[PDB]
Amino acid sequence: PKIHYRKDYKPSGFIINQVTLNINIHDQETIVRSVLDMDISKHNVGEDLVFDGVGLKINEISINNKKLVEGEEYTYDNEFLTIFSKFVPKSKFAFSSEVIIHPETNYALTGLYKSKNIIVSQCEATGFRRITFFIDRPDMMAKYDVTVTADKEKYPVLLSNGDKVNEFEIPGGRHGARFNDPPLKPCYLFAVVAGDLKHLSATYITKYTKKKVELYVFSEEKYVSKLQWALECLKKSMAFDEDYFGLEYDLSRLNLVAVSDFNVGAMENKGLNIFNANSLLASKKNSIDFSYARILTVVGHEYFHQYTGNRVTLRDWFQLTLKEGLTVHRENLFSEEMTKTVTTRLSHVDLLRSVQFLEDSSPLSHPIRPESYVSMENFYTTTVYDKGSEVMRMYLTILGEEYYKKGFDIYIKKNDGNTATCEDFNYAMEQAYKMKKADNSANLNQYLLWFSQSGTPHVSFKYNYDAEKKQYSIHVNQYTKPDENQKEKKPLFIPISVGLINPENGKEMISQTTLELTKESDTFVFNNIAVKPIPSLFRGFSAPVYIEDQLTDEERILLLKYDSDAFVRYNSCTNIYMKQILMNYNEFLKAKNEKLESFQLTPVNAQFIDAIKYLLEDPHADAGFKSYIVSLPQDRYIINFVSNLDTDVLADTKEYIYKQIGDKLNDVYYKMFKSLEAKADDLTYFNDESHVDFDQMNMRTLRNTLLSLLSKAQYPNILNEIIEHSKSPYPSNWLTSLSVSAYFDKYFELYDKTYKLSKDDELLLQEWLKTVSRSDRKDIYEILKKLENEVLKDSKNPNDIRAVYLPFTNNLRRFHDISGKGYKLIAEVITKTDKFNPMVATQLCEPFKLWNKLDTKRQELMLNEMNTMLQEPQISNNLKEYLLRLTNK
């Protein structure tokens, strides 16, 4: 396998000026004719002409309308087409070809493929070379003129980029459309779609130039009534970019299309965005509440790529974080503004500190700009997207809104063009930084280490208060553990948003202040501090770091009650739980290792329980926040703090802490679950397709969280509540009724009732599968085998496969069964999936990422399964490279 290095970037010695495509789709094959108008670039050194082209069946190739001869003038090995230089012209010339491809049997979902009755393309990153020959790298910009033909009855709707310029009838029941897209684009932004598509549409009038933009959202006919929310999300997304960034859509039309079979969430092809149906379609009757935030963020994300990816483009794939990290940052600012709930930011932090921190301390650790790759298929990671987004968000923290907006406008003005690199972005923020400091010596040079250095920095704190002097000092230290990418880790530029809270009255003692930590350690001193403060550190989670606050639980409890920053309040509560978790885990571990006949456990801090009750009982406090404070930190967050983690000991620890708190608060939880009903489940706008109330949904989250706590505890007669909840019209409630009934004899009665409610909507059936998979059932292995035989069968839909298996892999007791049977089962699924879809096979490897963090026995069980998968003779390149890197071999 060839390793591509970032240091090795060089421009092509060719240019492709114009692509003219004819894509003729037939029952058993698709014929693709392509003419490329080419030139020799100024970098050319007389080399062979080499096209990417994977799995293509050549009918013929030509230069300037003369057929080329296989063997004597060119070789093709199913990956590269090599035309020997003696036969390549030295001025403007035309290369043509006709190849045959087979979208019907393309089950890897990359290139051109069939999803149910829709034909659709997926070109990022290197899928265009599965459609026709090309120099398939993002710096090859060309013009595109595309014609598609197909059977009119099967494929009445034909779409590709640009203007539809001609439509025409073809003998034998066929038809055609031609689309011309004159502005230059990279080939990974080409798209085509054909199908019996239905739609909703609206007209949006831009803010400044008042251009009419037509918006179309498409699906298969069955689900067209689930498109309205997506259309509202698109309007909101355009308004946002207009209001916050001053940016208007440049084209006359934007199409959104939902497909059933898709590897990720969606894709930003220019004016033709294609989506996983689960991230475009929703209704109140047939979707859980999560689908509403999901569609808003995914529609938003692909819209924002129209500037950050599509008009300012990447030179090479190493700069991927520049388009993805920045688009995620734009997406998160939009979500925050649209939902107006504090749990939106908290949920982004929850994701980074569980999943991304785990990745960053694993053998897979990489900086947000890597120095090498082998498979572009495995490069689209939480580190590139989500830590990339936190790095892009730190510029805004450092500069503030006014100067951030100035530096961004600087980057967009200069590079609307025009490929760019991460240094160009940094340069633009620097110019805003010079202007902010009003000092032109000031620079962001050290900031660049955020792109190049891998691993999570640890940031720790000591304090001093001199009561006579009224002088308060915060001593800060940063450290990043050496790893495979850097032996010596340099200090980063770490912005620490802070407040100082008066412990007597809960008030702020200082204005907004962001500490700029630029050295291994520094001491920040504040004068005129009248009383000893509690420091509120990393407000908003202002850098992607392990925060070691060194506060007492009494201080943490005070922040949790009285601080103004949601993240700090949640983090204080998190740190109280972690102190408790590590304590009880070591007490359980000692008792198991020493085989003790009796031992003691440290109870949960009583004043922390009192503070939870105080917050729950506060009718003005936020319900979404309340659901965060009654839940323990995620297992994948906990694992970052324990060596050789025994998952059974952690399951017993979590069980003890939940029971400790429930034994004090279950009456309070019951009362709230009942008093929340009226507002949480209010049906007033149930038939209003466009009315989405994020606060109401967070009330439902809370009720569903409290119901789960009450069921685990077997609170008296709670089954009555579960059975009533199953009759709710909201799928969030009735699916919740299924999972909490796991602890009762009614489980299979609700399994059947909710299957029946779910079975006729393809997405809602996928949510039912996830609910079953995640159910806390002792017979969960037999239940999985039942879903396999009855519901999943041999589905190659990645949504179906992921729904049956991924939630189960989070079942701490059972997936991690000491016999290794769970690791066995997931490995069998990965290998089976790898036969047809290597990308999804790699996604199904996710539970294995923490393998070297677990206890001795479990490390060995997981390594065994990874080595077994690695030894499969038919392993894909993608799965092989991933598992070799994961197992350090």
Ligand X SMILES: N[C@@H](c1ccc(-n2cccn2)cc1)P(=O)(O)O
Out of Mg ion, Zn ion, ligand X, none, which partner does residue 266 contact, by CB within 5 to 8 A per kind?
Answer: ligand X
Q: Is 55 in the site for Mg ion (CB under 5 A)?
A: yes
Catalytic residue, chosen from 302, 390, 865, 881, is 302
Stretches 327-335, 609-617, 723-731, 865-873: which one binds Zn ion (CB under 5 A)?
327-335
Out of ligand X, Mg ion, Zn ion, none, which partner does residue 55 contact, by CB within 5 to 8 A per kind?
Answer: Mg ion
Binding mask 823-862 for ligand X (x = CB under 6 A): ----------------x-----------------------
Given the DSSP bridges, would you call strands 66-67 and 197-205 parallel, antiparallel or unpaired?
A: unpaired
Cα 134 from Cα 49, distance rounded (Å): 11
266 assigned ligand-binding residue:
yes
- Residue 87's contacts (CB-CB under 8 Å, 6 or more residues apart) are 63, 68, 73, 74
Angle at 316 between CA 312 and CA 317, to 5 degrees: 100
324 assigned ligand-binding residue:
yes
Cα 434 from Cα 399, distance rounded (Å): 10
Does 266 sit behind a cis peptide bond, omega within 30 degrees of 0 on the bond before it?
A: no
Out of ligand X, Zn ion, Mg ion, none, which partner does residue 820 contact, by CB within 5 to 8 A per kind?
Answer: none
Cα 730 from Cα 288, distance rounded (Å): 7
Q: Which residue, 55 or 89, is less far from Mg ion as judged by CB?
A: 55
Q: Is 267 in the site for ligand X (CB under 6 A)?
A: yes
Return the residue of 147, 160, 263, 842 that touches ligand X, per CB under 6 A: 263
47 assigned ligand-binding residue:
no
Q: Which residue, 106 or 831, is less far from Mg ion as judged by CB?
A: 106
Q: Is 301 in the site for ligand X (CB under 6 A)?
A: yes
Q: Does residue 256 contact residue 234 with C-beta atoms inside 8 Å?
A: yes
DSSP helix/strand/coil, 149: strand
- Residue 438's contacts (CB-CB under 8 Å, 6 or more residues apart) are none
* Closest CB to Mg ion: residue number: 55
Return the residue of 265, 363, 506, 820 that touches ligand X, per CB under 6 A: 265
Q: Which two tokens stand for residue 851?
A: 């393998």
Cα 611 from Cα 616, distance rounded (Å): 9
Q: Does residue 603 contact residue 660 with C-beta atoms inside 8 Å?
A: yes
Q: Which two tokens stand for residue 759?
A: 């079975």
Q: Does residue 38 contact residue 64 with C-beta atoms inside 8 Å?
A: no
Closest CA to 434 of 407, 396, 414: 407
Q: Is 264 in the site for ligand X (CB under 6 A)?
A: yes
Q: Which two tokens stand for residue 625?
A: 């926040």
Q: Is 104 in the site for Mg ion (CB under 5 A)?
A: no
Q: Which residue, 97 or 736, is less far from Mg ion as judged by CB?
A: 97
Out of ligand X, Zn ion, Mg ion, none, which partner does residue 265 contact, by CB within 5 to 8 A per kind?
Answer: ligand X
**Residue 327 Cβ vs Zn ion, minimum distance, rounded to whole Å:** 5
Binding mask 88-127 for ligand X (x = CB under 6 A): ----------------------x-------------xx--
Binding mask 286-325 for Zn ion (x = CB under 5 A): --------------------------------------x-
Q: Is 635 in the site for ligand X (CB under 6 A)?
A: no
Q: Which residue, 232 or 324, is less far from Zn ion as judged by CB?
A: 324
Q: Does residue 524 contact residue 503 with C-beta atoms inside 8 Å?
A: no
Cα 18 from Cα 359, distance rounded (Å): 41
Q: Is 363 in the site for Mg ion (CB under 5 A)?
A: no
820 assigned ligand-binding residue:
no
Other C-beta atoms closer than 10 Å to the C-beta of 434 total: 17
Q: Is 68 in the site for ligand X (CB under 6 A)?
A: no
Angle at 706 between CA 704 and CA 707, to 5 degrees: 60
Q: Does residue 106 contact residue 113 with C-beta atoms inside 8 Å?
A: yes
Q: Does residue 470 contact residue 530 with C-beta atoms inside 8 Å?
A: yes
Binding to ligand X (CB under 6 A) within 334-393 occurs at: 377, 380
Cα 156 from Cα 167, distance rounded (Å): 11
302 is catalytic: yes
Binding to ligand X (CB under 6 A) within 311-340 occurs at: 324
Stretches 1-9, 299-307, 564-572, 849-857: which one binds ligand X (CB under 6 A)?
299-307
Q: Which two tokens stand for residue 100?
A: 């045959």
Q: Is 107 in the site for Mg ion (CB under 5 A)?
A: no
Given the DSSP bridges, would you call strands 313-314 and 419-420 parallel, antiparallel or unpaired?
A: parallel
* Closest CB to ligand X: residue number: 267
Cα 208 from Cα 330, distance rounded (Å): 21
Q: Is 465 in the site for ligand X (CB under 6 A)?
A: no
348 assigned ligand-binding residue:
no
Q: Which residue, 529 or 839, is less far from ligand X as judged by CB?
A: 839
Q: Which amino acid is at 434?
A: K
**Residue 831 Cβ vs ligand X, minimum distance, rounded to whole Å:** 20
Residues that bind Zn ion (CB under 5 A): 324, 327
Q: Which residues are annotated as a binding site for a peptide?
A: 124, 265-266, 268
Residues that bind ligand X (CB under 6 A): 110, 124-125, 263-268, 301-302, 305, 324, 377, 380, 839
Active site residues: 302
Residues that bind Mg ion (CB under 5 A): 55
